[PDB]
């Protein structure tokens, strides 16, 4: 898993994109570069023992969607070290760094049944005080919980499901 080797490249690409105001273009460029890594015929090539510059130049050819200087230079640097498979993770950490810089959050709300669209407003308003960030809800429906709601925001959860209450009571005894 490339979570740890992706961090440097994500930070470098985000800093560069920030200086030149093109964060929104860089995210699209990385999305496409990550998509070409999932291809059946390319994921075969990336595993071969090709020399780095040959692998880069044969990978660059498959993408005209990259701003010719810098977007390709990132590919070349990654290919030198043999890390082109890390792109699908450089993308996610780029998105995370962006969400941090634009102080935005995306909190899941899991419920037994859909909420009234007046409840959601209150939840979002309250979270925007729980967090400095502007929230974006993505509610869901689950039948294991059967009353209350689960609010999951990153790796912090606020659990008000009746299911959680039952299985937390059972342990008191």
């Amino acid at each position: 898993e490339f979570i740890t080797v992706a961090r440097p490249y994500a930070k470098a690409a985000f800093d560069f994109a920030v200086e030149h105001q093109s964060v929104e273009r860089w995210q699209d460029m990385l999305a496409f570069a990550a998509e070409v890594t999932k291809n059946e015929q390319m994921a075969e090539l990336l595993s071969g023992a090709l020399a780095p510059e040959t692998l880069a130049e044969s990978f660059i050819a498959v993408a005209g969607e990259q701003l010719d200087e810098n977007g390709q230079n990132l590919i070349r640097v990654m290919a030198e070290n043999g890390r082109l498979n890390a792109l699908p993770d450089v993308l996610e950490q780029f998105i995370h760094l962006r969400a941090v810089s634009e102080a935005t959050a995306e909190v899941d709300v899991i419920s037994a049944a859909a909420l009234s669209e007046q409840q959601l407003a209150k939840i979002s308003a309250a979270m925007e005080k729980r967090l400095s960030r502007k929230v974006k809800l993505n509610a869901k429906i689950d039948k294991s919980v059967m009353a209350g709601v689960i609010i999951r925001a990153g790796d912090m959860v606020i659990d008000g499901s009746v299911r959680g209450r039952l299985e937390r009571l059972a342990d008191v005894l």
């Binding site: 419920s111 009234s116 059967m146 009353a147 209350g148 008000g160 009746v162 039952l166 009571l169 005894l173």
Partner: protein, 52 residues
Amino acid sequence: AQAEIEAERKRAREELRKQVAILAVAGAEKIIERSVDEAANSDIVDKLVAEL
């Protein structure tokens, strides 16, 4: 021999408590799953958002 009887008392008592405790939770679960209705669900959520 007396201590060996005291131990058996304590142990049977504990077992008898265990059974009733797990039946209490199972019963509360069945009752809950049988009794809930939309006003009660909303009553729960609308409260938890206030202490959120």
